[PDB]
Design an enzyme around this catalytic site. Sequence first.
Site, PDB file in Angstrom:
ATOM      1  N   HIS A 247      -5.701   9.217  -1.506  1.00 33.45           N
ATOM      2  CA  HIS A 247      -5.771   7.712  -1.809  1.00 33.45           C
ATOM      3  C   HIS A 247      -4.660   6.920  -1.890  1.00 33.45           C
ATOM      4  CE1 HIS A 247      -5.367   7.820  -6.162  1.00 33.45           C
ATOM      5  NE2 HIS A 247      -5.804   9.257  -6.055  1.00 33.45           N
ATOM      6  N   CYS A 248      -4.653   5.463  -1.995  1.00 33.20           N
ATOM      7  CA  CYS A 248      -3.686   4.471  -1.965  1.00 33.20           C
ATOM      8  C   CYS A 248      -3.644   4.557  -3.660  1.00 33.20           C
ATOM      9  CB  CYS A 248      -4.204   3.194  -1.526  1.00 33.20           C
ATOM     10  SG  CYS A 248      -2.854   2.055  -1.694  1.00 33.20           S
TER      11      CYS A 248
ATOM     12  N   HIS B  65      -7.549  -0.542  -5.498  1.00 35.20           N
ATOM     13  CA  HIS B  65      -7.155  -0.094  -3.988  1.00 35.20           C
ATOM     14  C   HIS B  65      -8.214   0.802  -3.600  1.00 35.20           C
ATOM     15  CE1 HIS B  65      -3.449  -2.327  -2.645  1.00 35.20           C
ATOM     16  NE2 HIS B  65      -3.894  -2.833  -3.815  1.00 35.20           N
TER      17      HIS B  65
ATOM     18  N   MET C 100      -9.738   2.473  -0.239  1.00 33.01           N
ATOM     19  CA  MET C 100      -8.470   3.313   0.262  1.00 33.01           C
ATOM     20  C   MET C 100      -8.469   4.740  -0.270  1.00 33.01           C
ATOM     21  SD  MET C 100      -5.473   0.515   0.861  1.00 33.01           S
ATOM     22  CE  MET C 100      -4.523   1.583   1.693  1.00 33.01           C
TER      23      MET C 100
ATOM     24  N   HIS D 146      -3.634  14.453  -2.763  1.00 34.77           N
ATOM     25  CA  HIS D 146      -3.716  15.515  -3.768  1.00 34.77           C
ATOM     26  C   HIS D 146      -3.523  16.886  -3.387  1.00 34.77           C
ATOM     27  CE1 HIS D 146      -7.045  13.296  -6.410  1.00 34.77           C
ATOM     28  NE2 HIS D 146      -6.057  12.510  -6.261  1.00 34.77           N
TER      29      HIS D 146
ATOM     30  N   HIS E 174     -28.122  13.131  -6.257  1.00 33.14           N
ATOM     31  CA  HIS E 174     -29.096  13.450  -7.121  1.00 33.14           C
ATOM     32  C   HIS E 174     -29.214  12.750  -8.315  1.00 33.14           C
ATOM     33  CE1 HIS E 174     -32.993  14.804  -7.707  1.00 33.14           C
ATOM     34  NE2 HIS E 174     -33.237  15.400  -6.462  1.00 33.14           N
TER      35      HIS E 174
ATOM     36  N   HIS F 208       0.963  -1.320  -0.109  1.00 27.76           N
ATOM     37  CA  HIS F 208      -0.226  -0.012   0.117  1.00 27.76           C
ATOM     38  C   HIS F 208       0.831   1.301  -0.023  1.00 27.76           C
ATOM     39  CE1 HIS F 208      -3.630  -2.471   0.787  1.00 27.76           C
ATOM     40  NE2 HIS F 208      -2.810  -2.932   1.592  1.00 27.76           N
TER      41      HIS F 208
ATOM     42  N   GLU G 211     -28.989  24.337  -5.624  1.00 24.43           N
ATOM     43  CA  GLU G 211     -29.826  23.145  -5.344  1.00 24.43           C
ATOM     44  C   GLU G 211     -28.960  22.131  -5.295  1.00 24.43           C
ATOM     45  OE1 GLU G 211     -32.891  22.303  -8.456  1.00 24.43           O
ATOM     46  OE2 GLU G 211     -31.544  23.501  -9.722  1.00 24.43           O
ATOM     47  N   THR G 212     -28.299  21.833  -6.102  1.00 20.37           N
ATOM     48  CA  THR G 212     -27.339  20.578  -6.470  1.00 20.37           C
ATOM     49  C   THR G 212     -26.088  20.943  -6.867  1.00 20.37           C
ATOM     50  OG1 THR G 212     -29.480  19.294  -6.658  1.00 20.37           O
ATOM     51  CG2 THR G 212     -27.224  18.405  -7.405  1.00 20.37           C
TER      52      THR G 212
ATOM     53  N   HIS H 170     -26.976  16.848  -3.128  1.00 24.89           N
ATOM     54  CA  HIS H 170     -28.096  17.788  -2.792  1.00 24.89           C
ATOM     55  C   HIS H 170     -28.545  17.480  -1.296  1.00 24.89           C
ATOM     56  CE1 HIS H 170     -32.099  19.462  -3.900  1.00 24.89           C
ATOM     57  NE2 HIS H 170     -32.509  18.662  -3.100  1.00 24.89           N
TER      58      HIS H 170
ATOM     59  N   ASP I 174      -1.325   8.858  -2.058  1.00 26.20           N
ATOM     60  CA  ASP I 174      -1.278   9.861  -2.807  1.00 26.20           C
ATOM     61  C   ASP I 174      -2.147  11.011  -2.062  1.00 26.20           C
ATOM     62  OD1 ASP I 174      -1.646  11.943  -5.073  1.00 26.20           O
ATOM     63  OD2 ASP I 174      -2.075  10.101  -6.403  1.00 26.20           O
TER      64      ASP I 174
HETATM   65  O1  NO2 Z   1      -0.440  -3.276  -4.002  1.00 27.93           O
HETATM   66  N1  NO2 Z   1      -1.134  -4.095  -4.662  1.00 27.93           N
HETATM   67  O2  NO2 Z   1      -2.067  -4.947  -4.742  1.00 27.93           O
HETATM   68  O1  NO2 Z   2     -35.338  16.600  -3.727  1.00 28.19           O
HETATM   69  N1  NO2 Z   2     -34.486  15.488  -3.720  1.00 28.19           N
HETATM   70  O2  NO2 Z   2     -34.571  14.329  -4.230  1.00 28.19           O
HETATM   71  O1  NO2 Z   3      -3.777  10.899  -7.710  1.00 32.03           O
HETATM   72  N1  NO2 Z   3      -4.067  10.195  -8.991  1.00 32.03           N
HETATM   73  O2  NO2 Z   3      -4.814   9.450  -9.187  1.00 32.03           O
HETATM   74 CU    CU Z   4      -3.724  -0.108  -1.055  1.00 26.65          CU
HETATM   75 CU    CU Z   5     -34.864  16.191  -5.563  1.00 24.92          CU
HETATM   76 CU    CU Z   6      -5.364  10.592  -7.407  1.00 19.20          CU
END
Ligand code: NO2
Ligand code: NO2
Ligand code: NO2
Ligand code: CU
Ligand code: CU
Ligand code: CU
Lengths: 341, 341, 341
Positions: free
Chosen positions: C128-129, C139, C144, C93, C300, C88, C273-274, C249, C91
């Site tokens: 994330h992994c 993953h 992850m 961002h 939504h 594992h 709204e959304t 939403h 990363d």
């Molecule tokens: O690290 N990969 O399965």
């Molecule tokens: O308004 N909500 O689905």
């Molecule tokens: O962070 N890149 O998949």
């Molecule tokens: Cu992983």
């Molecule tokens: Cu709605």
């Molecule tokens: Cu990424």
Amino acid sequence: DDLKLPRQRVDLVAPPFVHVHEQATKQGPKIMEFKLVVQEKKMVIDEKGTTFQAMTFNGSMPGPLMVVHEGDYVEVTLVNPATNTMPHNIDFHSATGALGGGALTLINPGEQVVLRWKATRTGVFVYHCAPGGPMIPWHVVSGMNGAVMVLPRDGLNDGHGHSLRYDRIYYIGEQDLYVPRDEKGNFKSYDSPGEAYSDTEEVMRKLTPTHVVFNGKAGALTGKNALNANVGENVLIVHSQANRDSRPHLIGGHGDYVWETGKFSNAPETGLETWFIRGGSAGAALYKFLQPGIYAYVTHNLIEAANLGATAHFKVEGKWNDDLMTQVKAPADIPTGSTNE
Amino acid sequence: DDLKLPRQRVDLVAPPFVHVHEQATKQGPKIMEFKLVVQEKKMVIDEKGTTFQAMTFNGSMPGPLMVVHEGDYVEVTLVNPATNTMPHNIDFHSATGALGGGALTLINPGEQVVLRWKATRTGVFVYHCAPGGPMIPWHVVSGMNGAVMVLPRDGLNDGHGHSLRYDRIYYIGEQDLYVPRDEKGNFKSYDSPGEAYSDTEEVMRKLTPTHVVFNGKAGALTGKNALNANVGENVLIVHSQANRDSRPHLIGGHGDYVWETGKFSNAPETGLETWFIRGGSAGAALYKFLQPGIYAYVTHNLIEAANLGATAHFKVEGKWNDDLMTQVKAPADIPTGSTNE
Amino acid sequence: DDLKLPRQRVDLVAPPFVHVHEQATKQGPKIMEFKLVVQEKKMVIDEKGTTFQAMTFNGSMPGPLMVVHEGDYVEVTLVNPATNTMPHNIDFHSATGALGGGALTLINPGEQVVLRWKATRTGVFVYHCAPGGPMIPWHVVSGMNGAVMVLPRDGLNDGHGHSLRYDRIYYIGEQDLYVPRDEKGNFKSYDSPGEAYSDTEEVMRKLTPTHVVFNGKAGALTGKNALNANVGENVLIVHSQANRDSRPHLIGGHGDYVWETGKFSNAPETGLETWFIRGGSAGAALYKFLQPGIYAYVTHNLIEAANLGATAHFKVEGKWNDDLMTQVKAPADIPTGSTNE
Ligand SMILES: O=N[O-]
Ligand SMILES: O=N[O-]
Ligand SMILES: O=N[O-]
Ligand SMILES: [Cu+2]
Ligand SMILES: [Cu+2]
Ligand SMILES: [Cu+2]
Ligand SMILES: OC[C@H]1O[C@@](CO)(O[C@H]2O[C@H](CO)[C@@H](O)[C@H](O)[C@H]2O)[C@@H](O)[C@@H]1O
Ligand SMILES: OC[C@H]1O[C@@](CO)(O[C@H]2O[C@H](CO)[C@@H](O)[C@H](O)[C@H]2O)[C@@H](O)[C@@H]1O
Ligand SMILES: OC[C@H]1O[C@@](CO)(O[C@H]2O[C@H](CO)[C@@H](O)[C@H](O)[C@H]2O)[C@@H](O)[C@@H]1O
Ligand SMILES: OC[C@H]1O[C@@](CO)(O[C@H]2O[C@H](CO)[C@@H](O)[C@H](O)[C@H]2O)[C@@H](O)[C@@H]1O
Ligand SMILES: OC[C@H]1O[C@@](CO)(O[C@H]2O[C@H](CO)[C@@H](O)[C@H](O)[C@H]2O)[C@@H](O)[C@@H]1O
Ligand SMILES: OC[C@H]1O[C@@](CO)(O[C@H]2O[C@H](CO)[C@@H](O)[C@H](O)[C@H]2O)[C@@H](O)[C@@H]1O
Ligand SMILES: O=N[O-]
Ligand SMILES: O=N[O-]
Ligand SMILES: O=N[O-]
Ligand SMILES: O=N[O-]
Ligand SMILES: O=N[O-]
Ligand SMILES: O=N[O-]
Ligand SMILES: O=N[O-]
Ligand SMILES: O=N[O-]
Ligand SMILES: O=N[O-]
Ligand SMILES: [Cu+2]
Ligand SMILES: [Cu+2]
Ligand SMILES: [Cu+2]
């Protein structure tokens, strides 16, 4: 009667047209009265005559556009005639509280209810049925969705202190449909919505529509039902999608001013090619036509546009502007002396 | 000859590279002359050697990037050699009228046509083939799409009165492909585009690509064809997708300035992790590299990136900045006295 | 030790809750110390008891929210206990260089690593992994992924010179899952992640999740685990999706201030709204509750919300405001003198 404001009854009109309204107003707040009548019925949804068991507000997909101004109160009578088979309600994304009104509007066949909501938020917004649980998506993708526009009292602006005024308005409701097929791939027919449900839910679960349509069917806004405009007119195009994303594009045009998230407190973006309506929202685009002719208005997943039903036309009258575009040389044989590698 | 401006012929280059141009210019408007030659051909689209019946502008997926300035006129000669089997045309999302030019450019094999459009709208824009009806999506997802950039005459700016200048530009065209499979799941081969059509259309209808690729094939911009840059360089990355949404991300970097809707009349957003290219559009991101090494540029549906082909690499030369990031302790056995619950 | 700043250890808490932090601070930059321990384990992901072979940071889907301020350094100890089966990494961002840290953090079972990254970019960001190749999506869609928030040192603002302060914060991690089915359609069970891989990858390739869940399972944030709030409170809702788009939403509410791309250097949009979380990103919304009761928080696409698991609830205490919304007339029989055509 605690709320002492003038009342105005609005007569709704079928999409893509919009009921009479003012853009800018100097009237004070009113109670704007609307009636929506649920209608379950079989409807034709494509050019080969495929039917499906629809559920609608006021007999149309989408439901009609409601237009009010910021600070108005919206008093909606929702009617569920006893010819219907299911309970229904209404959720206004423009409204505050009680799941948009859904928690106050559940009605059985034979009943009606009256909801009032204050229009405190400007923009275009979805409204849709939402009975509860799995019935929520089913009623919405069966057709029970529309939109409401809450205009600023001074009308639209460009976010930079300049008023914007439209000459024409259209409401494009986009609907994703999930029609069951038999083992040979042919669309199945049913005698009621309840009979269609189980098979429909299985299609819904795979998140791939069989049809994506404007104004309730493939071809609804093409041919004799193309949208009219004229060179010079500023046209507002309201676009809603209550369940699934869309990417509107006016082929041969642009979005001069686009509120893709649909809310007039935010400045529009300018000069877009394609915009994005997130599922569960309405957005709006203004465009001033510069050239006559046919325009296609699509979602720009072109497979959806051309093969699943999601194309409208505008027919625009006026004079061609050769400065903006011209055919310098018509199609002709490739010259013998050409090299084209 | 009514239009009395200087003419300049542009020689296009294959993506991801871009023809020579000025960012800011003090030249007045010109007629910028481009030639695009349609080429139908079988192409390899993945690392296992899968082929498919492609249709291209100028032999590449994407078609080449065209670059002009606001107020220029763009005179495009579209050529359909007689070795091709189908009619073709071109729709410029940058252009006004006649379905973007598609209604003025339909040519049979053996013909050419000359279209002129005024570059009145700034930004990056898709161009694509659009013959009519179901042929529209088919020609686009077969590879017939590219982009054009219309720069402001003063070059790019940050929307807050500061000029932005790139050291390098790359054009990343993303293509969704729909390759038929046989009953065992193996990709099918055909002898012509026409023979591939029926099976391809069936895959298209289910809206799930088999491949999502940059520069026409899985791995096209990895290995020896990684994109070069240097620490300190401001790199413009233009990204297009003519049919389907994408979510670009530069792994280990950011978008310093991003026009996700792709239109330079709108201020860019700053410091994005991931941005969004709506299907039927181009967008652009500027990033100033701060660290050397390998960067992956992906659509951040990681299944599409890693398993359907949508990863490019940048190889960036320079010196590592341990202030921005450092490995404090290299991998080591978990200490005996640790508790890790 | 080159970097001479104060160190502060942070104890993470399980989502949807967030560890103690300051919004605005006058402390200078610190080295903020975090520990993440990978845990592979079978987890229940729906209301029928479906299990799947998850891979997690700190035992949760999503991984916990980390909160720091602009200019802090983030020193992360990543631990891969020897009870795990796979390598594992991580990363960020939010980080600059080495694929977000993934290129400096690959650890086998039995190892740990210490990465430091400078928090130079404000916003909410995915982590994330990303081990390499096809293991990257696997993953991430196995669980992850989490998020980090980098606040401005002065706290949030409305982009127009006014401070914004939240009373409460929740972190909603949305997870798309790809659970294999047998020939009868029943979800398959496995004894290890490695045994699940081949079948899972086949589901992944078709880009249609079987489940879309908040906080790791259908119903996780409904019932007794509904999110609490009070009328008047300004609530920040951070939403992440590391692989797939989402459209949040708040049913019965709005987004008062929304950073849909999730980066605090950009002014928020108002009154949505959304909103739209692009796959591979985090975004954030502020909402001041105005009405008591139950609110549903959904993506939504209502099919995903109601039928694949993607609904949370808020339970909001306070007094109802009949000015914003009222039931004028409760459900009643349609009057005999009505015409409803
Ligand atoms: O690290 N990969 O399965
Ligand atoms: O308004 N909500 O689905
Ligand atoms: O962070 N890149 O998949
Ligand atoms: Cu992983
Ligand atoms: Cu709605
Ligand atoms: Cu990424
Ligand atoms: O701009 C965010 C703003 O929304 C507020 C405005 O004061 O209210 C909105 O909802 C309220 C419902 O009464 C109204 O004040 C307002 O007119 C409308 O946009 C707050 O809750 C907040 O500052
Ligand atoms: O789509 C699968 C398969 O079904 C058939 C009938 O066997 O056509 C059906 O599906 C088509 C595409 O949706 C429709 O055009 C038509 O209305 C419907 O019968 C086959 O023709 C197609 O191969
Ligand atoms: O900003 C909206 C604006 O687009 C306008 C600008 O005046 O025009 C665009 O298209 C026209 C094509 O001639 C040009 O005026 C302009 O230079 C370009 O962006 C209007 O139609 C409108 O106000
Ligand atoms: O994808 C289904 C099934 O088809 C096989 C061949 O039977 O592999 C094909 O599909 C793979 C994924 O797209 C490709 O990697 C390969 O080029 C193609 O032959 C099976 O291996 C797979 O199980
Ligand atoms: O606004 C774009 C800006 O990002 C810059 C800011 O000067 O830097 C960002 O990344 C750098 C990492 O050191 C920092 O200067 C800055 O504090 C952060 O947002 C440039 O690379 C550029 O002008
Ligand atoms: O979805 C196909 C098919 O499978 C069955 C079992 O045969 O149900 C499974 O799929 C359902 C939807 O995902 C789940 O509700 C359930 O946990 C699962 O067994 C059928 O009932 C369904 O028709
Ligand atoms: O009150 N004037 O329209
Ligand atoms: O039936 N709809 O327009
Ligand atoms: O009201 N539900 O069918
Ligand atoms: O350019 N329209 O597909
Ligand atoms: O006319 N000057 O480049
Ligand atoms: O063939 N395309 O780069
Ligand atoms: O031009 N159509 O195949
Ligand atoms: O240094 N003051 O919190
Ligand atoms: O297991 N997740 O909250
Ligand atoms: Cu209903
Ligand atoms: Cu073509
Ligand atoms: Cu187009």
